[PDB]
Amino acid sequence: LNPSARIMTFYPTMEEFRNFSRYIAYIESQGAHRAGLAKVVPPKEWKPRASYDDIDDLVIPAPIQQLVTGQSGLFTQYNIQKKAMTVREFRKIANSDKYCTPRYSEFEELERKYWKNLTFNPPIYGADVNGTLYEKHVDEWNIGRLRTILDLVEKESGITIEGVNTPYLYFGMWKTSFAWHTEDMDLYSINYLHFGEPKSWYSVPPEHGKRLERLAKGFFPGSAQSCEAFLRHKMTLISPLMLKKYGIPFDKVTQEAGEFMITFPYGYHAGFNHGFNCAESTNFATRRWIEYGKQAVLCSCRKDMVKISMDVFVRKFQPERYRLWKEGKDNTVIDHTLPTPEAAEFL
Ligand code: NI
Ligand SMILES: [Zn+2]
Q1: Which CATH class is domain 8-346?
Q2: Which ligand has the shortest distance to the CA of 226?
Q3: Of the residues 23, 134, 170, 192, which is catalytic?
Q4: Which of 276, 100, 310 is nearest to 193 (CA)?
Q5: Which of 2, 61, 115, 125 would be a feasible disulfide site paired with 176, CB 3.0-4.6 Å?
Q6: E strand spans, 218-274
Q7: d(Cα 231, Cα 36) in Å, to the nearest integer?
Q8: Active site includes 170?
Q9: Is 199 annotated as a binding residue?
Q10: Where in the cell is it found?
Q11: Neighbouring residues of 192: CB distance < 8 A, sequence distance ≥ 6
């Protein structure tokens, strides 16, 4: 099943689209999780919002200017907090001559331009805006309420973690980047591209994630010494040519307006925006995640980074291991190829 761990694309019917959790289980039955990233194109008739012109009374509280330093396919991205702005201000900069999408023919050309120009003309990214663009009425794949076991954090312990159990909006322009990372606690993510230009993604299969970590640690021994999981800083950019040179297996895919991307536990990904767009994002879980959460290597160097108590998950969903786990004896080795238990119905 998917032996090259390539990114798969799915086209559910409206009937299939109703049960979020079941559909994640299904795409894992087909091997999607091996890639680390999958694309889901929703039914033609489904839309999460009637229109998107009413936008600008929405504030971007903390836009970030992305300064990139490096050379030879290896970069560090510094995020500089700017003053709050409207979508309107963002769009104007996005579409200005200095700071709009270059003319290009094929993706491959736009990609070359990205990697050639990523240290020049620092763009602004309207990242991490708390809020949703779904209407209250929309029940299918509603990023504001996906109803997975992740809900145990909010319902059992009361804690809300912005962008993790709540929706974030991202306003992109040309050449805004997301650095190589897995999700907080090695969770799943869902990303819906509401409108605008594409977002391009790179992915490294979870079964090869340790190999990328080794590579990263090799290139930045400074950061390795100061932090157990420096990639969680979301500052490290590494080009596909670099990955290819060091034999890291990876895939690429472009997400267009109206498509969902799913990332899987321990799926390293990175990418960039083609132009003005808006994405909405959140984290979520399945039972398979539990072991990943238990085994996640967290940032040890800056505090108020995202940590979830695994206790409630182990007790409830792995009752046979709860004791072994509490006394630190567990020792389960994760098999990255195994689909989530809920997929049994389809296997
Ligand atoms: Ni991510
Ligand atoms: Zn750290």
Answers
A1: mainly beta
A2: 2
A3: 170
A4: 276
A5: 125
A6: 236-238, 251-255, 260-263, 268-273
A7: 16
A8: yes
A9: yes
A10: Nucleus
A11: 48, 141, 143, 259, 260, 279, 280, 281
Q: Is 326 helix (H, G, I), strand (E, B) or coil?
A: helix
Neighbouring C-alpha atoms within 13 Å toward the C-beta of 68: 28
Residue partners of 102: CB distance under 8 A and separation at least 6: 110, 113, 174
**137 annotated as belonging to a binding site for a ligand:** no
Strand 188-196: give its sheet, edge to edge.
8-10, 37-40, 260-263, 188-196, 277-284, 168-172, 124-130, 64-71, 74-81, 236-238
Q: How far is the CA of 179 from the centre of ligand 1 (A)?
A: 9
Q: Give me the phi and psi of 228, to 5 degrees please.
A: -75, -20
CA 222 / ligand 2 centre spacing (Å) = 12
CA of 298 to the centre of ligand 2 (A): 7
Residue 25 Cα to ligand 2 midpoint, Å, equals 32
What does the buried/exposed string (b/e) look like for 103-120 if buried means 16 or more CB atoms within 10 Å of the residue's CB?
Answer: eeeeeeebbebbeeebee
Ligand positioned closest to the Cα atom of 269: 1
Residues 6+ positions from 292 with CB-CB distance below 8 Å: 185, 186, 187, 265, 266, 334
DSSP state at residue 60 = E
Cα 311 from chain centre? 25
Q: Please, what's the b/e burial string for 253-290 (b: 16 or more CB within 10 A of its CB; e: otherwise)? A: bebebebbbbbbbbbbbbbbbbbbbbbbbbbbbbbbbb
In the annotation, is 183 catalytic? Answer: yes
d(CA 279, CA 214): 31
Q: CA-CA distance, 309 to 68, in Å (whole number)?
A: 34
Task: Give residue 301 CA to ligand 2 midpoint distance, Å.
Answer: 4
User: 200: closest CA among 254, 260, 238?
Assistant: 254
**Which residues, other chains included, contact 157 with Cβ-Cβ below 8 Å and sequence gap of 6+?**
309, 312
Paired strand residues for 66 = 79
